[PDB]
């Protein structure tokens, strides 16, 4: 199962970040509408979220679910986090290879202020 | 690829009408084919493995991989991690052209032909069979090879049972004698 394999892949990282006790930037990727979220160390609340599923961010990019979409979401999370106040975060692959859209989102985020 | 268009042209409709499914994807469809060659005699002479792999590359469109023994058994004098066979799995588009070569030029050239078997089903919808000699495929000139070893074929589809798998194969004008 794709989901079961993915959860098994990301379990070690999630546990490592959980015991470390640090805010983590978690990204969920699908064939469309790449998501992104910021989670408190306790893991119970979401500091801020962004994605291409809402019209506020989906009204510019031609198509959601590409490199451009990842950069927009990656950038979008940036100023939101900077405005909120949190600066340092830990990136979570969530079992997605850090190659394409995931890398583009992270690259946009780190260059936008969320260094990690 | 030509039969893939043929499959997409009316065979899907033929499957649709006969089983009157609710949807279109319910019809069984082939996803991959697998070629096996359990040589077994690697112990006597491991050098022949390379050429045994070579001919499979002649029939197939890609390089085979050599499989290793799952475990060591004293009854066969084989140790764990020792190559004792090769296989090939082909899917996507290349499977279709190979399926042509099997169904058009290979089956007719069977020595002492009697008819393709129809009871060779695993019980879930997957078909398997074997061949005596390589010359059935055109890629053997009878002078560059001097071995009688055969090979095994196996086509797997998304059928939930044998009845639709047999019906789907029948749509491909299989002998089934």
């Amino acid at each position: 199962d794709k989901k079961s394999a993915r959860i098994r892949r990301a379990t070690r990282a999630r546990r490592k970040l959980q015991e470390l006790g640090a805010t983590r930037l978690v990204v969920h990727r699908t064939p469309r509408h790449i998501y992104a979220q910021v989670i408190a160390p306790n893991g119970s609340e979401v500091l801020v979220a962004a994605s291409t599923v809402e019209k506020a961010i989906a009204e510019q990019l031609k198509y959601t679910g590409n490199k451009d979409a990842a950069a927009a979401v990656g950038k979008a999370v940036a100023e939101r986090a900077l405005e909120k106040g949190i600066k340092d975060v830990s990136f979570d692959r969530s079992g997605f290879q850090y190659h394409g859209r995931v890398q583009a989102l992270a690259d946009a985020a780190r260059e936008a202020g969320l260094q990690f | 690829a030509k039969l893939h268009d043929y499959y997409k042209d009316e065979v899907v409709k033929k499957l649709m009408t006969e089983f009157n499914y609710n949807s279109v994807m319910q019809v069984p469809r082939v996803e991959k084919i697998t070629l096996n060659m359990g040589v077994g005699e690697a112990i006597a002479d491991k050098k022949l493995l390379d050429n045994a792999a070579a001919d499979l590359a002649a029939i197939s469109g890609q390089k085979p991989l050599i499989t290793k023994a799952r475990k060591s058994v004293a009854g066969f004098k084989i140790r764990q991690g020792y190559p004792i066979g090769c296989k090939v799995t082909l899917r996507g588009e290349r499977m279709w052209e190979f399926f042509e070569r099997l169904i058009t030029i290979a089956v007719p050239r069977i020595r002492d032909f009697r008819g393709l078997s129809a009871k060779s089903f695993d019980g879930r919808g997957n078909y398997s069979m074997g061949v005596r000699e390589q010359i059935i495929f055109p890629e053997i000139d009878y002078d560059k090879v001097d071995r009688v070893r055969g090979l095994d074929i196996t086509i797997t589809t998304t059928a939930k049972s044998d009845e639709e798998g047999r019906a789907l194969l029948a749509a491909f004008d299989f002998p089934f004698r």
């Binding site: - | 590359a57 469109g61 390089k63 052209e97 089956v107 007719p108 055109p138 004008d173």
Partner: protein
Amino acid sequence: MKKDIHPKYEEITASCSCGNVMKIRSTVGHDLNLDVCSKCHPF
């Protein structure tokens, strides 16, 4: 698809004795001559 590890997969036209001609991509080589095919055979 890996490079420079697979045999050449060029197209080639093959015809049999009963007048049926078809194009197939394989590793047969330069030319091919057949006598029977799917049809025109006592199967």
